[PDB]
């Protein structure tokens, strides 16, 4: 008795042939296994949906209350490009070039690409590589 409401944060551009967007679960790297993902069938731009949930929050949404307090984020899948984002077996195109198998300087370059990313904000290879979740499930 009340259609559950999801509150999502999405990249601006998605609001821009036919029905385009698709939600799908896949093999979450880092062992995970069991994770949702948004795919833009205008070719990839893979998206990682992680949810914010801390104890004792709920939403008023219009003339209504939702109980979670949940805040879902869709973020371009992977790298340093999505480290400002939540700061507050199908695919195609650019696949060959997106390959370049597991190199220590893939890690070295990404864990630095994300160092320059965590370099503009006070914590304490390029765009969303739809491969960080294409190596854990292909190589192993």
């Amino acid at each position: 008795l009340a259609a559950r409401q999801l509150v999502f944060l999405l990249p601006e551009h998605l609001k821009d042939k036919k029905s385009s967007l698709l939600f799908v679960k896949l093999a979450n790297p880092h062992s995970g296994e069991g994770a949702t993902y948004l795919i833009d069938m205008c070719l990839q731009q893979l998206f990682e949906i992680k949810v914010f949930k801390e104890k004792h929050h709920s939403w008023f949404i219009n003339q209504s209350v939702q109980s979670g307090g949940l805040l879902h984020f869709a973020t371009p899948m992977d790298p340093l490009f999505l480290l400002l984002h939540y700061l507050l077996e199908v695919n195609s195109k650019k696949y060959y070039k997106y390959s370049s198998e597991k190199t220590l300087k893939w890690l070295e370059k990404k864990v630095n690409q994300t160092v320059v990313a965590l370099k503009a904000n006070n914590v304490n290879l390029k765009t969303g590589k739809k491969n960080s979740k294409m190596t854990a499930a292909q190589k192993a």
Partner: protein, 113 residues
């Protein structure tokens, strides 16, 4: 296996979202504009307001730069049910400024479901 065409999250109408420091344990319609809204006041800090007789202090909070807020009714086909760029972040007795997982284990995790 859920689909949402970009026409839903396009034109979808504006929504007011408050995020309370308290979990109302059943999702349900609620007379927000009768009981909550008329209680909200403005001052030099964020906002006061009452709920269940407890004092609340709020801040407006902006959706991250380069982003957009959507209320999706999980049922049918994703389907954006409203839109937002900002939400009031209510907290208890205090604004709740600086940082709590909100404006930042960062909190937040994976999704399944």
């Amino acid at each position: 296996r859920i689909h949402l065409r970009p026409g839903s999250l396009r034109g979808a109408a504006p929504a007011k979202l408050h995020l309370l420091p308290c979990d109302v344990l059943v999702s349900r319609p609620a007379p927000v504009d009768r009981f909550f809204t008329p209680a909200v006041r403005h001052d030099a800090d964020g906002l006061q307001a009452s709920f269940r007789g407890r004092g609340l202090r709020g801040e407006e909070v902006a959706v991250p730069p380069g982003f957009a807020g959507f209320v999706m009714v999980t049922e049918e086909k994703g389907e954006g049910l409203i839109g937002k760029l900002n939400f009031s972040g209510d907290a208890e007795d205090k604004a709740d400024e600086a940082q709590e997982p909100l404006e930042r284990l960062w909190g937040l995790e994976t999704v399944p479901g």
